[PDB]
Ligand binder design. Structure first.
Ligand SMILES: [Mg+2]
Ligand SMILES: [Zn+2]
Lengths: 36, 66, 86, 1223, 552
DNA sequence: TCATATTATTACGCCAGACAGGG
DNA sequence: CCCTGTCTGGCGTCCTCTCACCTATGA
RNA sequence: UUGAUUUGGUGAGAGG
């Protein structure tokens, strides 16, 4: 819940968290307003 | 880009555990390069404490006592 | 214990300083027995004795004179893992 | 009428469509191919005779001797198949070839030879095929798998997008020979035509035309049509056929006959072409700016001065016209280079060409092919005249000539094997036509463009390699031949043919070890069509489209049985009805439809024929005459499933099984499963272990009979008759007189193969299913093999399954099993392990087979004889001694005595010993002490095994409950196995539920018959209920003729039905749902398929009634006590100091790269430090750690890993000085 | 080293060094003999190529080979590649004190502990058992202890339960992608041969139970036991590091047990009776006097912590059901009652655990995750939530929708015979009307499933959401979506051929009706493309993770 | 047994990176 | 001399399990 | 001082 501690490797957890959902991803007129 | 950026590092073991080792070892050899270890995979190669986790206090101590 | 790893080119004086003996003959081993080749790729004098603290051919079968090299053996006298670093 | 094991238990067969063609013999690819290879077939095609008629008669280079051929033969094998598997020899036959040497005098092409000699020489041994489609190569039983490769003959491929990065298409054209050099033509983005041979350097393609003795004018005659400029009254008028103006801009004034036809500015329309053809317009006067860009066709020379005006293929300017007009050449031939249609590709290639005549063309081709070594007239001419034009080194086969004439729209289909001039010119013309627009490319996945190699073709190609090596040897010996002192074995040598053919049958990518744990798995490894192998594509490179299913797979290749993983769709399995074409393509049956009436004649088609016709669907309703009952029917025209009229169709599908294979047509309710789960279901159904008690799928498809017969695991009777039944050793069948030969009085004695090792350590065992004094017919079964029950196919067993969550024990895919499954031994399978012990003479004398085992005390001499080797049969486990096999001088004596591996038990079932002549036999030399001991573990079932149904419902059996805690219905019976309903909405394999309900109905009929027969009734009520059970519902094919079963065959049938009435639900024409409900109403079961169930724990009802039924669940051979492994400390490798890998090596787990990244992701710096230094590699660290642990001090003294110092020495062993710096 | 036999399987570097030395000896002898120029040029050139082949083989023209045509492996090929020293022996190592076996469930576990077999436990903990045996005094030398555990006497199992007790192990599923794929548990010994793994933790490992295998690793030293307990313990990983979402979300059986428990029906046993607490709500459910879903006024006492760290009790009567009170007996103190007052699908139970973690911290969220899993499994067992053939209700309007679409394609093709419209506009009109008919069939079956139950209470009828089994498996979010339940009842859309363009004739038959032959073949097009995509996609996904953790 | 020393197939798909060609 | 096809090198997922097969020559 | 060979390398197939 708190801030990142002095030390915790954030590059590796970040790289794993971007590359880990790599399996779930796939591989292969004019303007009309909506609200008011 | 990420593979050109991890192969262009100031630590040739970090850039040799990754892709092509021939290019990086000849560049480091003819440059006379030196690897002040200072990262995670140099210390996973050379067999010591990671300078991130629990070993960050150990590397604070070793960097303080130089 | 140690800081940075340094990589550089290998001078011929540096390669002769690494070395422990010139590997002449290409003959690997005897192949009909168990002995190697003197003095080929897998030498005795250039590297070390196969057996720990033993002259491979015949002298020193106890723990007293670790090092003597007779002319009949042309062999060093150290550990089994000594050849892995030489 | 039925045969006598058909009246034993006749399966209730749903299915409305009457089948017209019965299933072909499922191993016919392997058997027909190898029967083509070895057969004495005169007229030469195909076989070994083709090899001998290609290689023979050998004549040397005018050496005046010519060894010719007569006849060949194969003698008896010296070892029959059983003792061949036991001994370890190949199952081969000696190839006795008659050879007739005749030797000439001087000057005898026509003269009679001076002497002859002739003998039945011996070359090689070829491995024969066993009657089931297998080989026995070195003791082990292997299978050659049929390849799927590109056909010989031209292919026009496009590669439309990726090259040039500009959206400009290319068009290449590959002439693929069956044997020889590859010739490819290809455009380049400058619109120039390029040739390349064998993927070498790129030559501009018309040089090959200049290599075929074509001048430039002949080439321009071929690839261009002439436009005639006549020198006339003024401005050098033009012959103009109006076709050439199609779609271009009128640059000048188009007028003739005193009338202005088309003015400048407007494009020429086809109405203007009609105006010029109606007005008969040919000759029109052109401006001088029209000829100022055109190109001359042929050469012209100034007549009086005697020199050249212009070379052929030269563009024209006005001063060039002033040169040629004043000389006296009145006709000017120009090349019509239409920018829309008729492009100038050959002409611009001629402008790229650095050559001018034939000789420089051949010198440039020779400098392409073989570089460095000089290009002389004889050498380059011999090269190019033997590239494509000699019968030796270039040979399009009959398949290649058929595809080559078919892709060029030639009339004939048979021709010569080599190419010619006209063939290369036609390939270039069709390629140019495809560039212009007319005609189109070919695709490579189209199974009319994709041939099958099989066993006979591959072995014939390897045998031809061996024969050309032995003919080079015969040409060697003959020119050095002295006569008459040699007879034809100083010339010929049996070594290269045997070496090549054992190289293929032993170490090839397709001669591979047979998946033998199951009759299904044998019969579906023999019917396999691999895209891999030599000359084909690889696993790790290609691709997307060759891994995908193409609309020509309908009825040739199974769409759904392909292994998941790294090779999907490369390892396709062949369909049920699909034969192989004469040329090797895949032809499938269809029913010929002349008019409204669909005729019962069949007719086979391949994919290059299936496109032209219109082919109906298998299930389209036709009633009593063959007329389609609708006026419109779903068909498919050219790979496009579309709706056509009642009377347009020319063919109909034969039967509705024909799309899928014999692995995935055994799955009932296939049409309700998803495609993915049918794939996983068929691929797991190959993997089932044979249980100890075979048990008859209640919901089958009726294809169990054909698979269990056609795979040779059951002892099908050769000649019908009665029986004598000694049987302890062999079934003895007395033969009826009509099938019995006049001499050779003769009674057939069948050998039953009792408990023995399969290739997957399962147990292949045959048991007699006929009694004594009982009639059998020809083709009937006598002995049930592994996983068979009265001639049917019983892979797994049928068990009572509830669909509900039960207290979490079946959470993701787990399966919760009662104790009644494990008490009855109804999955307790039998595994057999062969263990060898040899006492080779490594060094310091030979090793020895004696009980006088050392250091070890009376814990060695125990399960053995009074003085050596495991006795016969006890309950040996792990750490025992089987064969005392230890040497002296190896105190200094040691224990190599082959023991029992860690964790296994068993009974020594057999001990074989063809040892070093002295143990106190037939085998090879070298090896001395040869003791093989056959254990047989009996593995039951346990928490951790893997079971699965037929639909893709995998499961690891989690809890083995007691009988009491099971969910019992109100009748009192516990349910056997609880599965999980949550798998069913996601994994859309809804067929397991209909199998569950229909199996519930099947056992409902079985319980009803078991009541009517246990509470025993006279047979009138049984035959009435059996007749009601076999009528049941819609219009079907079975009904029964039950009142002709002699009042005893009703009772024997009802004895074999009291475990449940077996129901055939065929593949796509299966049982509908209303018939399941109606069959559940014949039995006294509730119509919904769902019974209220109480709980065995609490005794109180589950709310909302649950599904109970019988699913046919299989035990796959992924058993948990072959996977459980642990390591604290043992042995390591040599080079590295890290632990070994595997289970058979007692090794530890590879803590790989992503686990190191996962420990770096935490703060696990100390866990990782011991994970890669102390636990793995550093030798001082691990010995200090083991002593620190056993002292009671959890503390590591790390040090440096050894493999990093190995890295330092391997890097340092280059010219690299890597070091370790300051303290 | 020699293999099993009488010959030496020699390495490739010995071939390389032996050739360089053979050539160097030849070159020294030729420079002794004073051979002419072209001989010693070829000799030195062969030595140059031999040295260049030793160092980095194959960088020069076609690489040399010994047996048979495969090139032999040089020094640079001992360094580079996937199988060099970096990627195969220095970044990843093989590891002692490690084990591997097939996993299975065991739902009795608390989420900090896992089941571990006795045979694997006695093999992985041999040195700790040796140290314990030597401490007691039962034996003397180390040999005696190795004979004792080789025999497995009656006293080493107490030694084993005294070395296990507070010693975590690292469980690891074999494709570890993120850091939640290595988690540390405490062992509980198992009669068996399969690792029993707590079910909630499975959603972190991507571990189903269809034949999976996991590796166990033992933290040897004392700092590693403390890192396994304080950083890598499974109670410590309850939030995914990629975001803020909880990773110990209850997966599939337990959300069905909750969705059947906290729901309602318009008449049951004990409709509209009043209850003095949740304890007698469970007592009325167990004795057989009310139903699990029967709407009822209860008196619950929710603790709202509105002060500064002080829990204030407020008790009131909530109009709720019986099941919501029974599930309120498990909720900790601080959460309000409205977290269970709704129907509790999967998103709602995930935000229940998330609000418990944000308010009450870690320890009530761990014990409440376990109590959620236990009560979900127990009432899913009591539910008897099967799946039948009658549960997939075919729309009665489905056949008329298909006939109206068939009349529309008949009109478009009758215009195509008379050439009024273009071919691309015909193909577009056919794909548009089959998309519209597909959406109408899906709405017909979705009405026919989501409100099919119509039961009266004391008079005229009144409708409600259905207790159909496949609809609770879809609406709960356990397993299933709109598309999968659509393909089991309504038509399964317009499948596409591998050309990338769609096919104008759809698959009008679902799976409860039978697919005929052509429709299944078009289905196999669509599914073979998906299997090929996953089995080739995984390589690029793994190589992307590698490039990312080596740039980081 | 103990030194002698290397030749007659093609059928991936990008994607950077270096190189001779030419307006 | 700045674009440019063209050619050459260098990537291409982790973990596990089962089986078989291993240079010729030679007075 | 009380004992021993696969890793090496290829090919084929399988599991998650
Ligand atoms: Mg799985
Ligand atoms: Zn000595």
């Amino acid at each position: 819940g708190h801030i990142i501690n002095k030390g915790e490797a954030i590059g590796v957890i970040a790289a794993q968290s971007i590359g880990e959902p790599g399996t779930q991803l796939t591989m292969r007129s004019s303007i009309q307003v909506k609200n008011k | 880009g990420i593979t050109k950026a991890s192969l262009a590092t100031e630590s040739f073991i970090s850039a040799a555990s990754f892709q092509e080792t021939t290019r990086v070892l000849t560049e480091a050899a003819v440059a006379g390069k030196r690897d002040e270890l200072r990262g995670l995979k140099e210390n996973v190669i050379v067999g010591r404490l990671i300078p991130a986790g629990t070993g960050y206090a150990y590397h604070q101590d070793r960097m303080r006592r130089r | 214990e140690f800081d940075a790893i340094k990589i550089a080119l290998a001078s011929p004086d540096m390669i002769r300083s690494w070395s422990f003996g010139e590997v002449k003959k290409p003959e690997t081993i005897n192949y009909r027995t168990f002995k190697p080749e003197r003095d080929g790729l897998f030498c005795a004098r250039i590297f070390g004795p196969v057996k720990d603290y033993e002259c491979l051919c015949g002298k020193y079968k106890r723990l007293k004179h670790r090092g003597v090299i007779c002319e009949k053996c042309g062999v060093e006298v150290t550990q089994t893992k000594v050849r892995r670093e030489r | 009428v039925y045969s006598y094991t058909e009246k034993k238990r006749i399966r209730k067969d749903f299915g409305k469509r009457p089948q017209v063609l019965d299933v072909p013999y499922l191993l016919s690819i392997q058997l027909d191919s190898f029967q083509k290879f070895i057969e004495q077939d005169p007229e030469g095609q195909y076989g070994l005779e083709a090899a001998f008629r290609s290689v023979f008669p050998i004549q040397s280079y005018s050496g005046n001797s010519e060894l010719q051929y007569v006849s060949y033969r194969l003698g008896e094998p010296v070892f029959d198949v059983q003792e061949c598997q036991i001994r370890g020899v190949t199952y081969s036959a000696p190839l006795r070839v008659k050879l007739r040497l005749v030797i000439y005098e001087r000057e005898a092409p026509e003269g009679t030879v001076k002497d002859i000699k002739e003998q039945e020489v011996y070359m090689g041994e070829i491995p024969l095929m066993t009657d089931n489609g297998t080989f026995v190569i070195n003791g082990t039983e292997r299978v050659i798998v049929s390849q799927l490769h590109r056909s010989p003959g031209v292919f026009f491929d496009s590669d439309k997008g990726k090259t040039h990065s500009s959206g400009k298409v290319l068009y290449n054209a590959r002439i693929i020979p069956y044997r020889g050099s590859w010739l490819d033509f290809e455009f380049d983005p400058k619109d120039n035509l390029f040739v390349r041979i064998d993927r070498r350097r790129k030559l501009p393609a018309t040089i090959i035309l200049r290599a075929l003795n074509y001048t430039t004018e002949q080439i321009l005659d071929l690839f261009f049509e002439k436009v005639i400029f006549e020198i006339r009254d003024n401005k050098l008028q033009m012959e103009l056929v109006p076709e050439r103006l199609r779609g271009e801009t009128a640059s000048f004034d188009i007028e003739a006959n005193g009338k202005v036809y088309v003015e400048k500015g407007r494009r020429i329309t086809a109405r203007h072409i009609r105006q010029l053809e109606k007005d008969d317009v040919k000759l029109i006067e052109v401006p001088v700016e029209y000829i100022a860009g055109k190109v001359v066709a042929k050469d012209y020379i100034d007549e009086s001065t005697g020199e050249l005006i212009c070379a052929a293929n030269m563009e024209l300017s006005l001063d060039l016209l002033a040169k040629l007009s004043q000389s006296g050449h009145k006709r000017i031939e120009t090349l019509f280079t239409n920018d829309l249609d008729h492009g100038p590709y050959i002409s611009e290639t001629l402008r790229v060409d650095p050559t001018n005549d034939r000789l420089s063309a051949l010198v440039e081709i020779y400098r392409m092919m073989r570089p460095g070594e000089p290009p002389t007239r004889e050498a380059a001419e011999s090269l190019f005249e033997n590239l494509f034009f000699s019968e030796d080194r270039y040979d399009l086969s009959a398949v290649g000539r058929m595809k080559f004439n078919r892709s060029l729209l030639r009339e004939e289909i048979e021709g010569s094997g080599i190419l010619s001039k006209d063939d290369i010119i036609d390939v270039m013309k069709k390629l140019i036509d495809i560039r212009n627009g007319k005609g189109e490319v070919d695709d490579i996945d189209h199974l009319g463009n994709r041939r099958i190699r099989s066993v006979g073709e591959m072995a014939e190609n390897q045998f031809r390699v061996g024969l050309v090596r032995v003919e080079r040897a015969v040409k060697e010996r003959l020119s050095l031949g002295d006569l008459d002192t040699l007879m034809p074995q100083d010339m010929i040598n049996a070594k290269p043919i045997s070496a090549a053919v054992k190289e293929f049958f032993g170490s090839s990518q397709l001669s591979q070890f047979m998946d033998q744990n199951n009759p299904l798995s044998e019969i579906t490894h023999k019917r396999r069509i691999s895209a891999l192998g030599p000359g084909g594509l690889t696993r790790e490179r290609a691709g997307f489209e060759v891994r995908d299913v193409h609309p020509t797979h309908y009825g040739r290749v199974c769409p759904i049985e392909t292994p998941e993983g790294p090779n999907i769709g490369l390892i396709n399995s062949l369909s049920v009805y699909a034969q192989t074409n004469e040329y090797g393509f895949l032809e499938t049956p269809y029913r010929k439809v002349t008019d409204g009436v669909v005729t019962d004649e069949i007719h086979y088609l391949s994919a290059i024929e299936e496109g032209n016709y219109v082919i109906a669907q298998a299930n389209s309703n036709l009633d009593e005459e063959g007329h389609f009952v609708e006026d419109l029917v779903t068909c498919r025209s050219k790979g496009e499933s579309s709706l056509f009229s009642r009377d347009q169709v020319d063919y109909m599908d034969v039967s509705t099984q024909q799309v899928v294979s014999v692995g995935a047509s055994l799955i009932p309710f296939l049409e309700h499963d998803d495609a993915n789960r049918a794939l996983m279901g068929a691929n797991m159904q190959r993997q089932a272990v044979p249980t100890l008690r075979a048990d008859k799928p209640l919901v089958g498809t009726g294809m169990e009979r054909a698979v269990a017969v056609d795979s040779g695991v059951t002892a099908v009777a050769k000649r019908g008759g009665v029986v004598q039944y000694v049987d302890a050793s062999r079934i003895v069948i007395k033969v009826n007189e009509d099938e019995m030969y006049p001499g050779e009085a003769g009674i057939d004695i069948y050998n039953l193969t009792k408990y023995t090792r399969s290739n997957q350590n399962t147990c292949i065992n045959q048991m007699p299913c006929v009694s004594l004094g009982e009639p059998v017919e020809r083709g009937d079964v006598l002995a049930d093999g592994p996983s068979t029950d009265l001639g049917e196919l019983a892979l797994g067993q049928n068990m009572r399954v509830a669909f509900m969550p039960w207290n979490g024990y079946n959470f993701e895919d787990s399966i919760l099993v009662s104790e009644r499954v494990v008490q009855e031994d109804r999955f307790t399978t039998i595994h057999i392990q062969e263990l060898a012990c040899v006492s080779r003479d490594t060094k310091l004398g030979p090793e020895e087979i004696t009980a006088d085992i050392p250091n070890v005390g009376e814990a060695a001499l125990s399960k053995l004889d009074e003085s050596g080797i495991v006795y016969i049969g006890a309950e040996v486990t792990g750490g025992d001694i089987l064969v005392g096999k230890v040497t002296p001088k190896g105190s200094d004596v040691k224990d190599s005595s082959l023991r029992v591996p860690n964790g296994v038990s068993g009974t020594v079932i057999d001990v074989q010993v063809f040892t070093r002549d002295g143990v106190e036999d037939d085998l090879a030399p070298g090896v001395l002490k040869i003791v093989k001991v056959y254990l047989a573990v009996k593995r039951r079932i346990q928490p951790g095994d893997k079971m699965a149904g037929r639909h893709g419902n995998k499961g690891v059996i989690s809890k083995i409950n007691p009988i009491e805690d099971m969910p019992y219905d109100e009748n009192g019976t516990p349910v056997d196995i609880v599965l999980n309903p949550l798998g069913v909405p996601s994994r859309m394999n809804i067929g397991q539920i209909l199998e569950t309900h229909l199996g519930m109905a099947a056992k409902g009929i079985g319980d009803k018959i078991n009541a009517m027969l246990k509470q025993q009734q006279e047979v009138a009520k049984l035959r009435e209920f059996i007749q009601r059970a076999y009528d049941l519902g819609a219009d079907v094919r079975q009904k029964v003729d039950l009142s002709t079963f002699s009042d005893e065959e009703v009772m024997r049938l009802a004895e074999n039905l009291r475990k449940g009435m077996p129901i055939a639900t065929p593949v796509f024409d299966g049982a509908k749902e209303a018939e399941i409900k109606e069959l559940l109403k014949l039995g006294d079961l509730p119509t919904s398929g769902q019974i209220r169930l109480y709980d065995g724990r609490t005794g109180e009802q589950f709310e909302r009634p649950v599904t109970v039924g019988y699913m046919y669940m299989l035990k796959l051979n992924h058993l948990v006590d072959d996977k459980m492994h642990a390591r604290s400390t043992g042995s390591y490798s040599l080079v590295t100091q890290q632990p070994l890998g595997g289970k058979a090596q007692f090794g530890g787990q590879r803590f790989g790269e992503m686990e190191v990244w996962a420990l770096e992701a935490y703060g696990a710096a100390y866990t990782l430090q011991e994970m890669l230094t102390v636990k793995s590699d550093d030798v001082n660290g691990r010995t200090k750690m083991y002593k620190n642990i056993v002292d009671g001090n959890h503390q590591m003294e790390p040090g440096m890993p050894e493999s990093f110092n190995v890295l330092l020495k391997e890097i340092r062993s280059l010219g690299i000085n890597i070091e370790l710096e300051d303290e | 080293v020699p293999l099993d036999g009488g010959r030496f399987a020699t390495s490739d570097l010995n071939d390389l060094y032996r050739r360089v030395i053979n050539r160097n000896n030849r070159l020294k002898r030729l420079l002794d003999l004073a051979a002419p120029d072209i001989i010693v040029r070829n000799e030195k050139r062969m030595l140059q190529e031999a040295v260049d082949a030793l160092l980095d083989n194959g960088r020069r023209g076609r690489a040399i080979t010994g047996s048979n045509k495969r090139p032999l492996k040089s020094l640079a090929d001992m360094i580079k590649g996937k199988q060099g020293r970096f990627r195969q022996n220095l970044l990843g190592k093989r590891v002692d004190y490690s084990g591997r076996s097939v996993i299975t469930v065991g739902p009795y576990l608390r989420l900090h502990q896992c089941g571990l077999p006795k045979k694997m436990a006695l093999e992985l903990f041999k040195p700790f058992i040796y140290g314990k045996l030597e401490l007691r005094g039962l034996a003397t030398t180390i040999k005696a202890a190795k004979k004792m555990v080789e025999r497995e006497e009656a006293v080493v199992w107490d030694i084993l339960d005294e070395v296990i007790r507070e010693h975590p192990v690292l469980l690891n599923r074999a494709p570890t992608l993120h850091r939640l794929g290595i988690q540390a548990f405490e062992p509980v010994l198992i009669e068996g041969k399969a690792i029993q793994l707590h079910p909630l933790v499975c959603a972190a490992y991507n571990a189903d139970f269809d034949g999976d295998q996991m590796a166990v690793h033992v933290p040897l030293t004392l700092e590693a036991q403390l890192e396994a307990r304080a950083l890598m313990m499974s109670t410590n990983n309850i939030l995914s590091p990629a975001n803020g979402e909880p990773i110990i979300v209850p997966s599939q059986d337990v959300v069905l047990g909750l969705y059947y428990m906290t729901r309602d029906c318009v008449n049951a046993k004990g409709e509209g009776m009043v209850l003095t607490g949740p304890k007698e709500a469970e007592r009325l459910y167990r004795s057989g006097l009310a139903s699990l879903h029967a709407r009822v006024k209860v008196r619950i006492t929710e603790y709202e912590k509105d002060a500064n760290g002080e829990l204030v009790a407020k008790t009131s009567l909530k109009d709720t059901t019986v099941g919501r009170a029974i599930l309120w007996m498990i909720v900790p103190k601080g959460l309000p009652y409205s977290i269970v007052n709704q129907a509790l699908g999967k998103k709602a139970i995930s935000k229940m655990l998330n609000t418990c973690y944000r308010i009450l911290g870690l320890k009530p969220t761990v014990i409440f995750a376990d109590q959620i899993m236990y009560t979900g499994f127990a009432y899913a067992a009591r539910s008897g939530a099967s799946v039948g053939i009658d549960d997939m209700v075919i729309p009665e309007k489905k056949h008329e929708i298909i006939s109206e679409a068939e009349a529309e394609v008949a009109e478009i093709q009758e215009q195509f015979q008379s050439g009024l419209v273009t071919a691309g506009e015909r193909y577009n009109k056919v794909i548009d009307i089959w998309a519209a008919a597909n959406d109408r069939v899906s709405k017909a079956m979705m009405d026919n499933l989501q409100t099919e139950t119509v039961i009266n209470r004391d008079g005229q009828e009144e409708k409600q959401v259905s207790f159909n089994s496949i609809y609770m498996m879809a609406d709960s979010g356990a397993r299933g979506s709109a598309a999968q339940i659509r393909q089991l009842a309504g038509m399964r859309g317009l499948m596409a051929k591998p050309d990338g363009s769609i096919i104008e004739t759809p698959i009008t038959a679902n799976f409860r009706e039978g697919l005929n032959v052509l429709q299944y073949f078009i289905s196999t097009h669509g599914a073979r493309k998906g299997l090929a995509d996953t089995a080739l996609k995984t390589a690029n996904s793994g190589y992307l993770t590698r490039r990312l953790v080596d740039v980081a």
